[PDB]
Amino acid sequence: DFMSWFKRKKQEEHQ
Amino acid sequence: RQWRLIETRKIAKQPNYQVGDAKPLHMPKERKKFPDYKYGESNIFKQSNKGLYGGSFVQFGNNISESKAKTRKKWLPNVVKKGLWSETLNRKISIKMTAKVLKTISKEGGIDNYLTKEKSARIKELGPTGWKLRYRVLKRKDEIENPPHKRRRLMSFLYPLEKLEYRSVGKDLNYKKFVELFADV
Amino acid sequence: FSNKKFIRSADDLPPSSHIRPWSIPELRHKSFNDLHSLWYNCLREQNVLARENHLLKNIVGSTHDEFSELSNSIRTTMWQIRHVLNERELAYSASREFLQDESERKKFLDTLANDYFLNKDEVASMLTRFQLAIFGISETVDINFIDGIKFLANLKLQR
Amino acid sequence: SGSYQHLSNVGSRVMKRLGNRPKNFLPHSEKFIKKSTPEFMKSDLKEVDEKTSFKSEKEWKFIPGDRVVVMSGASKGNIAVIKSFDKRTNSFILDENGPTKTVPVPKQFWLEGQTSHMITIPVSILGKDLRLVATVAVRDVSFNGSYYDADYKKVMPYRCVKGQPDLIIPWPKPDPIDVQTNLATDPVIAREQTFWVDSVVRNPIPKKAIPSIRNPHSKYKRGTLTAKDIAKLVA
Amino acid sequence: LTRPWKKYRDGELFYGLSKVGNKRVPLTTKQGNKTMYKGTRASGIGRHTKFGGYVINWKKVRTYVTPDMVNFELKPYVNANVPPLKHEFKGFSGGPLDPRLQLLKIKEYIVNGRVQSEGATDTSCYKERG
Amino acid sequence: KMTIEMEEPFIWPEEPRPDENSFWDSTTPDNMEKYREERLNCLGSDANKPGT
Amino acid sequence: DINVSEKIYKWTKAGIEQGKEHFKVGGNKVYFPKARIILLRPNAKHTPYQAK
RNA sequence: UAAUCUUAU
RNA sequence: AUCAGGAAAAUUAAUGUAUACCGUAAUGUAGACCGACUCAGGUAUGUAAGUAGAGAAUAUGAAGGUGAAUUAGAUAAU
RNA sequence: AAUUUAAUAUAACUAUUAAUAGAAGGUUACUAAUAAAUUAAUAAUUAAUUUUAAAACCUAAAGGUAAACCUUUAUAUUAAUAAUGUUAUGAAUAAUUAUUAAUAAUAAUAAACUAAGUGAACUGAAACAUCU
Ligand SMILES: [Mg+2]
Ligand SMILES: [Mg+2]
Ligand SMILES: [Mg+2]
Ligand SMILES: [Mg+2]
Ligand SMILES: [Mg+2]
Ligand SMILES: [Mg+2]
Ligand SMILES: [Mg+2]
Ligand SMILES: [Mg+2]
Ligand SMILES: [Mg+2]
Ligand SMILES: [Mg+2]
Ligand SMILES: [Mg+2]
Ligand SMILES: [Mg+2]
Ligand SMILES: [Mg+2]
Ligand SMILES: [Mg+2]
Ligand SMILES: [Mg+2]
Ligand SMILES: [Mg+2]
Ligand SMILES: [Mg+2]
């Protein structure tokens, strides 16, 4: 769950 | 008397196979030559499967002394090798017999007669070998009585024509195959 | 490799929402050659992923598994393709069996004759298609071909 | 790792035994797992088995994108748009307004614009703990009809409020998947029909291809009997 | 020392963790005598010679036949904007293997000549007959 | 594992940096493994002992 | 006329020239192969003209 | 000695 | 010399031959096998530098390998 | 709205009673997938009934073997055609590919209960031998 959240956060940061 | 060691025997009931049904996993190579003997094949005095023992199995019992000290003994039947004449087969058939069985044969007036007696007791006290012998004799008697006519050439005549017809369409045709096709017709 | 990359990053990979495996129905109306090509593309993709997946597991000791999921998905599509290929053959075999039963075939021929052939309010095109469909006659020789010729002659006589 | 285990299925029975642990020794199994995992990784909720997993959109009462009020918790009476569900746990990850925990995190997993190792992260939460909203919250939702969605591209059910069925709670329209990948075939080519059932004489796929398609020596496919075979069998 | 961090005698082995273990576990290619030949299902290809050689039988050798004109536009995945298609076979007990259905399809082909289906024409479509 | 000889040469592309690629970055999984080892194999007063 | 190894070499050369197979193709036609292969990184013992 | 039995071809 | 010494599986000519699978590390008079142990035990074969010699005895040791899960001191009685 | 108590789970065994019926393991990989119909109910549906796909190797009994391997050659003949190249004189002889017809094959199978065959000894008799 955490890993997925972190990935989502990274994606958001990118875009 | 009784036929306990014979009529106790049970054999796996084969399911009746329809022409359209699925195969069993292990179908045998060569077909069944003889009819099924009701009482299978003896699983104790297997010595007696090879001969006409007249339902006389080996006994086991006790040797008993003056002191009554019991000791296990066995009581074998009076077996004997004996080539006896079959009128039906037109040959003598050599087998192991009990002396009792030989006596019965003599009484009945032949070996074929002994084999072919319709009573259930006889059937029980025939072996698997005895059953096969009976079948051989009975079949031979039937043949003697009733020759085929009282067709093969027609089949032989038609076969080459049938083959030619097949070739004209495009396929080749063997005899054996032709025979298989026109057995029931 | 893929775009000459030692390893596809998360951004370089195709995302899960954008990608779907093939549906069996979709596969069912694709030609044999096309299906074969698709299969080989799938296999190629798996190889690329397999190389990468191995590197990931053996060296870095990851448990990210995107590549593995992709490989699985491809494998799913492949077996679906294999299934549709088998299914088509079976359907063909069933049709052949049906045609072999003579009365049914005759009925089918009669039905064909009634509706579309011998009618007005194209015919040649239908015949050419029908010829290919039912008999071995394109624009070589057999009993079936002969039968088809005879049928065609009969139709001509009727018309 | 330096494993090679992943290119095979070796020690299969042992793996099965390990994988399918008895359920009454599940606490035993997970106690050590919990210990092993760091605080920022581990979750409080029970990792449910794939049998008891909400695969359908009826089984999940809520979809990622819809707005939900939280209750039975610390951040209760809080509206939150649910971001993504967790499949193994059977739970939802809410946005900033939902329930969270502040936990230390290593610099491998640092977001751009962080001073401290301490970071607030969203905890998972069950569908039982949170109720829909439309402002009016919904006590319970029921499904009675179904229809093809244009955006979702599925035959989805109609979320209706429990009791009065005409009050439909609509599904949240998802984000547009702008697909630009070399491994995804486009809509026109993906569906274009190149096969037609035409020939009865010529078989569609060649004879040399059949062995790949099906096993010609299949032990399962039993042969049918004939008259001759029957005769051979029977005495 | 075998390993310098272990100065004193712990019950650690010279190599590995345990000497003992289940001996009854299937043989591999590496194990056994010089004469022990396991094999790996790789070569029922040719025939062994009288003298100990080998002669390949090329009619019994695996080729991997690839299509001559590769449709590269077909990809391992489909674009997810396309819905997953669904066929319906109502009035056909056999389903896609139904001979009646096949006959109908053949008839349609004969009449029309390679007309694309609902799903094939329209990508927005999700259910279909064929 | 089968080696092949081929008439044209080939050299692999250079492996990416830790910062560049997400997956090819062995620090995280190795750290996790180390942490697991520490926690399971921690016995008594090494619970108080600070983490590596 | 000529020895076996030389004949084989000649055949291989001919196949290369053709752009056909440089080897006798078998008859056991596998249309839909399921086998995957993992291209490995090169060891020190190999050249740039090898791949494993 | 076409009771039995042993051997060889 | 008496102790009297295995078994079993052809040749010319023409036409072929694209050469399959498995073994290959290191250890093996041993810490890597059999002895409950990194056990002075047990464990098959071939080379086994020269100088010396009857020699594979014995001395030395070119090369190679090794100097070790115990050390440092003290060295009473025993 | 929550808490407690008692009962119920795909998720214990044991004994009894009642009712009903007579049933795959392992090995490791080129992993061993499924598709449908009709009827009822509530287009998707759950339920019932029926059809259908794939499914490696080993588990005495195709032939071997040191279980998960090897060898047999059904991606075979044999024939009939069609297309290709060579030999010798339109017809003949061999090889390769592609259709059509013909030819055989896959034992992993319970355990308890029953019936039959053979049939102990310790032990008891305060010994022991009939007897047990
Ligand atoms: Mg032991
Ligand atoms: Mg060895
Ligand atoms: Mg060799
Ligand atoms: Mg070695
Ligand atoms: Mg070596
Ligand atoms: Mg040992
Ligand atoms: Mg000892
Ligand atoms: Mg030692
Ligand atoms: Mg010397
Ligand atoms: Mg020296
Ligand atoms: Mg050494
Ligand atoms: Mg020492
Ligand atoms: Mg078997
Ligand atoms: Mg052998
Ligand atoms: Mg008894
Ligand atoms: Mg007593
Ligand atoms: Mg006594």
SS3 (DSSP) at E99: helix
Q: Could you write out the DSSP letters of every residue in C90-140?
A: HHHHHHHHHHHSHHHHHHHHHHHHHHTTT----HHHHHHHHHHHHSS----
> Considering CB atoms only, which of G31, G36, G41 is closest to C46?
G36
Contacts of D137 (CB under 8 A, 6+ apart): D69, D131
One DSSP character per residue, G1-52 reads ---HHHHHHHHHHHHHHHTS-SS---SEEESS------PPPPPTTS-TTEE-
User: Which H or E element spans position E63?
Assistant: strand E62-64
CB-count exposure of residue D23 (10 Å: 0-12, 13-18, 19+): exposed
Contacts of D24 by beta carbon, 8 Å cutoff, 6+ apart: none
Which of F1, F4, F12 shows the shortest C-beta gap to G50? F4
Q: D216 CA distance to ligand 13 centroid (A)?
A: 18
Strands B59-63 and B71-75: antiparallel
Chains F and G touch (3+ CB pairs under 8 A): yes
Task: State how far the Cα of F6 lies from the Cα of E121, in Å rounded to an integer.
Answer: 47
Chains B and G in direct contact, meaning 3 or more beta-carbon pairs closer than 8 angstroms: no
Smallest Cβ distance to A5: which of D89, D93, D112? D93
Q: Which helix (H) or strand (E) is B116 found in, with range?
A: helix B111-116
Across the interface, whether the CB atoms of A4 and D83 are under 8 A apart is answered no
E73, D185 Cβ separation under 8 angstroms: yes
How many angstroms is C1' of I31 away from CA of E1?
11
The conformational region for residue D222 under phi > 0 = left, psi -120 to 50 = alpha, else beta, is beta
Contact residues on chain C for G30, CB-CB shorter than 8 A: none
Using the structure, give the distance in angstroms from the CA atom of G49 to the C1' atom of I46, rounded to a whole number.
Answer: 40
How many Å from the CA of E53 to C1' of I7?
Answer: 24
In the DSSP assignment, the letter for residue C59 is: I
Question: Any idea what the Cα angle at residue B97 is, between residues B93 and B99, rounded to 5°?
Answer: 130
Query: What one-letter code names the amino acid at E30?
Result: K
* Amino acid letter, C59: I
D147 CA, J31 C1': Å apart: 37
Does the beta-carbon distance from D189 to E116 stay under 8 Å? Answer: no
Task: Name E112's Cβ contacts closer than 8 Å, sequence gap at least 6.
Answer: none
The span from the first CA to the last CA of chain C, in angstroms, equals 64
Q: Which nucleotides of J are covered by protein (CB under 7 A)?
A: 1, 10-11, 25-38, 42-46, 51-57, 66-82, 96-103, 105-108, 115-120, 129-131
**Alpha carbon distance B136, B132 (integer Å):** 6
F24 CA vs J5 C1’ separation (Å): 58
Q: Which residue has the tokens 């997956």?
A: F23
Q: Chain C residue closest to D187 (CA)? A: C26
Q: Does F25 sit within 8 Å of C60, measured CB to CB? A: yes
Q: Which candidate, B86, B76, B85, places its Cα nearest to that of B53?
A: B76
Q: Please tell me whether residue A4 adopts helix, strand or coil conformation.
A: helix
Task: Tokens 């390679």: give the residue.
Answer: E114
Closest by CA position to B39, among listed B6, B3, B5, B1: B6
Quick check: E119 and E125 in contact, CB under 8 A? Answer: yes
Give me the residues of D, 118-147, that contact A with CB < 8 A. 121-122, 124
- What type of residue sits at position G7? K
D68 SS3 class: strand
Please give the Cα distance from C97 to C105 (Å, whole number).
10
Residues 6+ apart with CB under 8 A from C27: C35, C80, C81, C84
Closest CA to B123 of B15, B37, B36, B44: B37
Q: Kindly list the residues from chain D whose CB atom is less than 8 angstroms away from the CB atom of residue G32.
A: 209, 212-213
Backbone φ and ψ for E13, nearest 5 degrees, come out as -80, 165
Q: Which of C71, C152, C87, C141 is nearest to C118 (CA)?
A: C152
The helix or strand, by DSSP H or E, that contains position D78, with its residue range, turns out to be strand D78-86
Q: How far apart are CA F5 and CA G50, in angstroms?
A: 5
Structural method: cryo-EM
In the structure encoding, which two tokens stand for residue D175, read together? 């984000």
Q: How far apart are CA D69 and CA D62, in angstroms?
A: 12
Report residue D93 as tokens. 């990850």
Q: How far apart are CA E85 and CA C21, in angstroms?
A: 12
- Residue D153 token pair: 């591209």
Using DSSP bridges, classify how beta strands E127-128 and E86-87 pair: parallel, antiparallel or unpaired: parallel
For D171, the 3-state DSSP assignment is coil
Say yes or no: D213 contacts chain C, CB-CB below 8 A: yes
To the nearest whole Å, the CA of F4 is away from the closest chain C CA by 16
Q: Mark out the alpha helices in chain D (DSSP H runs).
A: 12-19, 26-36, 187-191, 210-213, 227-233
> Rounded to a whole number, what is the distance in angstroms from the first to the last CA of chain B?
50
In this complex, whether D and G touch, counting 3 or more CB pairs under 8 angstroms, is: yes
D185, containing H or E segment: strand D184-185
C81: phi then psi, degrees, rounded to nearest 5: -55, -50
Q: For every residue of B22-39, which 3-state class applies, written as one string?
A: ECCCCCCCCCCCCCCCCC
Q: Are B32 and D233 in contact (CB under 8 A)?
A: yes
| E positions 56-115 inside 8 Å of D (CB) | 65, 73-85, 102, 105-106, 109-110, 114
Say which residues have a Cβ less than 8 Å from residue E33's Cβ, sequence separation at least 6. none
Q: Map tokens 């909720």 to a residue.
A: D45
| Closest residue on chain G to C85 (Cα) | G32
The single-letter code of the amino acid at D100 is: T
Return the DSSP state at A13.
H
Contact B53, B76 (CB under 8 A): no
Tokens 């829909």 locate to D132
Q: Which nucleotides of chain H have an atom under 7 angstroms from any protein CB?
A: 4-5
Task: Give Cα separations from E127 to D57, E86, E124 (angstroms).
Answer: 20, 5, 10
Contacts of D6 (CB under 8 A, 6+ apart): C53, C54, C57, C58
If you ran DSSP here, which 8-state letter would residue D114 be given?
A: -
Radius of gyration for the alpha carbons in chain C, expressed in angstroms and rounded? 25
Q: What gap in Å lies between CA B137 and CA D75, rounded to an integer?
A: 101
Residue whose token pair is 């031979």: B140
Q: Cα angle vertex G17, ends G15, G20, to 5°?
A: 40
What secondary structure letter does DSSP report for C60?
I
> Where is B73: in which H helix or E strand?
strand B71-75
Round to whole Å and give the CA distance between D84 and A5: 9
How far is residue D194's CA from residue C37's CA, in Å, rounded to a whole number? 13
Chains touching C by CB (3 or more pairs below 8 Å): B, D, E, F, G
Distance D49 CA to J13 C1' (A): 24
The answer to whether D200 touches C34, Cβ cutoff 8 Å, is no
Residues, CB < 7 Å to strand H: B 80-83
By CA distance, what is C87's nearest residue in D? Answer: D213
- The reported resolution of this PDB entry, expressed in Å, is 3.2
